[PDB]
Design an enzyme around this catalytic site. Structure first.
Site, PDB file in Angstrom:
ATOM      1  N   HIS B 177       0.998  -1.114   0.014  1.00  0.00           N
ATOM      2  CA  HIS B 177       0.027  -0.036   0.104  1.00  0.00           C
ATOM      3  C   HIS B 177       0.643   1.353   0.005  1.00  0.00           C
ATOM      4  CE1 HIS B 177      -3.211  -2.690   1.774  1.00  0.00           C
ATOM      5  NE2 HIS B 177      -3.428  -2.718   0.721  1.00  0.00           N
ATOM      6  N   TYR B 232      -3.121  -5.063 -10.855  1.00  0.00           N
ATOM      7  CA  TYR B 232      -2.376  -3.940  -9.979  1.00  0.00           C
ATOM      8  C   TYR B 232      -1.545  -3.004 -10.788  1.00  0.00           C
ATOM      9  CZ  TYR B 232      -5.054  -5.741  -5.953  1.00  0.00           C
ATOM     10  OH  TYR B 232      -5.860  -6.175  -5.115  1.00  0.00           O
ATOM     11  N   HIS B 381       1.642  -8.897  -5.254  1.00  0.00           N
ATOM     12  CA  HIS B 381       0.661  -9.464  -6.277  1.00  0.00           C
ATOM     13  C   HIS B 381       1.333 -10.141  -7.374  1.00  0.00           C
ATOM     14  CE1 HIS B 381      -2.658  -7.701  -3.980  1.00  0.00           C
ATOM     15  NE2 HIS B 381      -2.141  -6.553  -4.418  1.00  0.00           N
TER      16      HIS B 381
END
Ligand SMILES: [Zn+2]
Ligand SMILES: [Zn+2]
EC number: 4.2.2.7
Lengths: 747, 747
Positions: B177, B232, B381
């Protein structure tokens, strides 16, 4: 050539073959004995056998020079030839009478023979040993036990006479005399013959060969070249090939890297239309008769079944007398031959060389251009010529200057030490440190001098210009002189429009420089009028801005200088070539162009002319040269760049191409004809956007160098032209075609 | 984009820009202020402004969701929109009443706003901060001293609520994040706004960015790709591009490696005819609405003035509400657009990726093939998918299996941890060590699982499957998974006949293997009937011969196995593609080919099915897969080779090419159609002579891999065919055309 069928054992970590417990095993096994009659009935080989019959006659007492040269012994005559032919006949007939005569005729003289100290006497001594070895091996079952012992002691006596000594611990395993006949033919031959009675000789001779000689050669063989120049190529590569044949015929298969097959292709590429070979290393010159590589082409062509090499042999199928037997035994008469005409026009030799040879054809109108990095120096007959280019077209144009022999003397001469083997003799770069010394105490075998002259050139490696023992010592020492950074040719593999080579040669010099790089770009212009061009781009960073920098261009005849233009012509010996250099950097405002040459200045080294006139009747074209041009910066500075563009043409060609320097963003470049070439402005990898403008009519061919390998995008006039093109790692280059406009490049 | 004009000074060895002493400096400076009127007069940009006028309306109280998601906040409405438009208007009119209103309308709520903790709430907090930063910077000259202090304390209060913390010391600088909005947009924006009063915020936010984020990104940017998979890519690359625009507009120029421009070309290459994107990393599937990379295309396309990227934006020129202001400010409306149709059919991404994407066209008949090495793993990811290939043609054929979400759950699901992110979900290689341990204790921040299932696959790097802090930590750790050995594509750059990739992926596995190598050769067959083929050649050496080896091929529908032949078809969702695999090694006598799949077996991992059914109405084509084929050797051996030849066609095609294995001297190869491809029998560099025979009619195209770079000679039927061809370093390959016969190659 046949598969290995012998036993192999490790000796001190090094795998070695055991001679088979059967005679004959020297130069042939029983396996090929029945074929000797076919060879005798082979009409191509009958003539060589006839040659040897003639060789049986003793020297006429009045014909004997009394200074028994190596040439005396290699012009083999008399008893030693007779007993060799006796042994051959014994193999073919098995008649106990003939084999005995060979033995009884040779034994006494083999024990008693004497040799006056003379030029390369080891060669005569070694060949006399070979004679005995042939008789010993070939008539082995005829030997009486007491005679075998007598032969052994005679061989040990003779072996001890050799320059390598016995034990063979003296001299060097990559260059010098120990890289000639004495070990790879002579001592090895005897060892194989007498192994059943005295295994020591083979163990010592083959021991050193497998440990040192072999390892050293296998190291550079993959790059398909040789390091001793275009004359000593002959004796050095011949003896490599003797070892090849001797060991394969012993039963050991091919012991070398099979890239050995392709080394002699270099000589083929370097052959001129006048029969001479492009210069390099220690060479002399003649226009009398063509230069041939007869023995190497015979041995290599026949072993590897190579048609290009067999063509080379067939040019002059005349082997020296002491080699006639080997042609009879080993020549492939069934092998075809190919002219070089369908060979690609450029050939590359990688590590440890980094050499490009580029041609525009195979006929009389051929341009022949050589470009050299040199990653390592091998010394002996190799020159300190890192960065050197050399151009031939209808005569030697940009020359490799000086001569091996002449008024100065031979190998030990002041000319060799101070000019010929030095950078100043070559089209390369000088940086002059007034405090630099050049240790030469170990150079040559006589007339030793502790130091050589300061030529502003490259280091003299070794312990006072002494070659290393072997590969181990070589790699551990100071013999590294450069690093290949980039290379390639294309777009077509057969007829490349360009040939590219870049090297960093900082290591070739002392700490007087921080960085030296040279990029060569040869252009095959595909035009009869102006067939070729070479662009040379140099970066030189001195450790002291006051170290005078020199860019050299050597010629036979006097250059004419007009502004930034140097014109060189050949007008003699039937030569008619022309070279024209346009100096782009340093720019005219920072450029001093000076010619030095003529009588008393032909071999000028900062205050002293190292005179070396030809022997009367030799070098009739004066390829040793008389002139050079030096391009020097006007302003003293740590960092300088050289950019020079050479056009090649007939001396009657009036119109040459206009040469434009391109001053771009992050790049400097050249435009002439339909060709555009760029380099990094710093000669360092460009990894960010750059660009330049092109003005002119028609389609241009672009070679952009010094680029970060990966995917580039090419824009012209602000519009994407090529969305994605790849710069590859080997050449770090972009290639494309385009028209005039403003170019940008993205990465 | 304008040239940098701010001061830079080192901070702990890292150069960083100082915000200029002027307002505005956030998202624009005075140099761009007059151009705001022109933008307001731009038809394209007036609409986005009108979009924003509409956004001014408050949420309907009944329509406000119970959970204030990140989606709630990104769907920006009400007061915060209003004050941003007030500030824009203040810049444009300089009316003191307007600037004062923006300040007074926002200040109370900015200091008192509360945000219910959720775990994606940082995005809403951060956007609220951005709203405040806009007012502060743009209306700076209207701020009273007391109000400045209130703003600073308010911003600090909000900053402390972000996941990265304040100071921003938590989370990771390459993934996670903290590689999203919170620093690169949100905290940085506020830092810049309040710098004159409170330089600490900028010093921390920009300090971490320049020290860590920028360094990591610049490291992989030159290879023009991203590591977080095809979903992503959006959020991650968008935020990189926010940092780009923010810093340039501040006066720092472009702080990124300009290779950044070319990253999004990968998405272009991966787009299918059905509107969806080729899978990779954490992704879900839809056939409903096409996937777009609107924000990255807007930001990268407009900054770098790239027409291919702008085309991508113009496919769906609708940014999320909270990004409308940035479209208005930063969009280039004069920029053109280009469809991908003239782009080269293959694109290479080098270190640290080693990825090839290869196509046969840009239209409905496109074959799309992905081949991956993976030199490093970035985690988060990204999947542990070294060596994986993926093929699309009229439907997903050889698939990247599993799905990100479903009945198993989301990111922390047993399906993610035990199948989806694991090698078993991919067309790669398994080696099952029963004693192997896979630590997963740090996955999902610090979530509960400790050890994941043994899939016989690749290592979980990091401290129990967590990403490193930054590049320094990454390079010092165990994140290396592979080594690119060779790569290249076909003779033509635009429409290559072949696309080649070789990787050593030993590092991706534990010590259960000694060596794992995979070579991919994709063939564009230039034929409508059978458009393409892929040859995959693997070398697997296990440390225990008893360690079971697996070669995987995943599909949606059930494969048909017949002898050495695997047929896969798409028959649903309007898809009609077909894949046919011919298994060449292991030989049929040592090959076991087994299909596993169907309900309860779709995500089978050695005894346990990690069920993950789609959420109702999602993944209607079931691209998560149901089936796989495992090819395993019959005999237990330390060393095994896999050779598989995949052909691609319409499922209506009855006639495919016959595939012949070539069993040569030192080489193993494949022949199909007019194509010959060889590999080293050992998958190690070939440096000695080799050969093989070819039987068949017409001209063949030869790709010979695993060769020692340098000059090779080609012989056919005992005669020199090509005297000299060059194998280059990047691909280590020879290319030529030839007819049937017996071939020998010399080096
Ligand atoms: Zn020389
Ligand atoms: Zn995956």
């Amino acid at each position: 050539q046949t598969k290995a069928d012998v036993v192999w054992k490790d000796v001190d970590g090094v795998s070695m073959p055991i001679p088979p417990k059967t005679h004959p095993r020297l130069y042939l096994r029983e396996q090929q004995v029945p074929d000797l009659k076919n060879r005798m009935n082979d009409p191509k080989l009958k003539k060589v056998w006839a040659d040897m019959i003639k060789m049986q006659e003793d020297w006429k007492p009045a014909d004997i020079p009394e200074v028994k040269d190596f040439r005396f012994y290699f012009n083999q005559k008399g008893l030693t030839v007779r007993v060799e032919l006796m042994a051959l006949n014994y193999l073919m007939t098995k008649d106990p009478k003939v084999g005995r005569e060979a033995i009884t005729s040779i034994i006494d003289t083999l024990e008693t023979a004497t040799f006056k100290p003379a030029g390369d006497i080891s060669r005569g001594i070694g060949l006399f040993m070979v004679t005995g070895a042939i008789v010993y091996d070939w008539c082995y079952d005829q030997l009486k036990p007491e005679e075998k012992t007598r032969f052994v002691k005679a061989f040990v006596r003779l072996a001890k006479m050799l320059e390598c000594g016995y034990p063979p611990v003296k001299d060097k395993s990559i260059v010098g005399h120990a890289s000639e006949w004495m070990i790879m033919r002579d001592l090895l031959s005897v060892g194989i013959a007498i192994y059943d009675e005295f295994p020591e000789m083979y163990n010592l001779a083959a021991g050193r060969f497998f440990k040192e000689h072999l390892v050293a050669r296998n190291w550079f063989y993959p790059s398909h070249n040789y390091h001793q120049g275009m004359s000593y190529l002959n004796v050095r590569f011949t003896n490599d090939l003797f070892a090849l044949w001797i060991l394969d015929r012993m039963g050991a298969g091919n012991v070398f890297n099979p890239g050995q097959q392709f080394i002699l292709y270099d000589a083929i590429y370097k052959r001129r239309p006048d029969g001479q070979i492009l210069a390099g290393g220690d060479v002399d010159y003649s226009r009398k008769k063509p230069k041939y590589y007869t023995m190497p082409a015979l041995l290599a062509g026949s072993y590897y079944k190579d048609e290009y090499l067999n063509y080379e042999f067939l040019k002059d199928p005349n082997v020296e007398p002491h080699c006639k037997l080997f042609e009879f035994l080993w020549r492939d008469t069934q092998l075809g031959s190919r002219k070089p005409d369908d060979l690609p026009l450029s050939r590359y030799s990688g590590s440890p060389f980094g050499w490009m040879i580029a041609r525009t054809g195979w006929g009389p109108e051929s341009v022949i251009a050589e470009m050299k990095v040199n990653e390592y120096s091998f010394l002996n007959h190799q020159h300190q010529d890192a960065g050197a280019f050399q151009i031939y077209y209808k005569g030697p144009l940009a020359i490799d200057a000086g001569s091996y022999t002449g008024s100065s003397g031979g190998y030990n001469s002041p000319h060799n030490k101070n000019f010929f083997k030095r950078t100043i003799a070559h089209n390369s770069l000088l940086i002059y440190d007034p405090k630099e010394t050049f240790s030469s105490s170990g150079y040559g075998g006589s007339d030793h001098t502790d130091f050589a002259a300061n030529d502003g050139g490259q280091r003299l490696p070794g312990k006072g210009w002494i070659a290393p023992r072997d590969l181990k010592e070589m790699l551990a020492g100071d013999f590294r002189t450069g690093k290949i950074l980039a290379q390639g040719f294309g777009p077509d593999n057969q007829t490349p429009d360009y040939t590219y080579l870049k090297g960093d040669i900082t290591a070739a010099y002392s700490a007087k420089v921080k960085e030296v790089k040279r990029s060569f770009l040869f252009l095959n212009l595909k035009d009869a009028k102006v067939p070729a061009a070479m662009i040379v781009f140099d970066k030189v960073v001195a450790s002291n801005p006051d170290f005078k920098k020199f860019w050299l261009l050597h010629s036979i005849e006097q250059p004419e200088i007009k502004g930034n233009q140097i014109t060189i012509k050949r007008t003699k010996n039937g030569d008619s070539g022309m070279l024209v250099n346009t100096a782009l950097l340093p720019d005219a405002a920072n450029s001093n162009i000076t010619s030095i040459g003529g009588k008393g200045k032909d071999f000028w080294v900062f205050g002293t002319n190292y005179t070396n006139d030809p022997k009367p009747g030799t070098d009739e074209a004066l390829e040793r040269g008389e002139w050079r041009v030096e391009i020097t910066p006007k302003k003293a500075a740590a960092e300088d760049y050289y950019l020079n563009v050479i056009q090649i043409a007939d001396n009657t060609q009036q119109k040459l191409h206009e040469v434009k320097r391109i001053d771009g963003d992050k790049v400097v470049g050249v435009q002439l004809a339909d060709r555009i070439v760029t380099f990094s402005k710093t000669s360092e990898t460009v990894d960010r956007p750059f660009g330049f403008s092109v003005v002119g009519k028609g389609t241009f061919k672009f070679v952009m160098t010094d680029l970060l390998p990966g995917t580039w995008q090419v824009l012209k006039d602000g519009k994407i032209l090529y969305p994605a093109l790849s710069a590859k790692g080997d050449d770090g280059a972009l290639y494309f075609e385009g028209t005039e406009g403003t170019y940008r490049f993205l990465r």
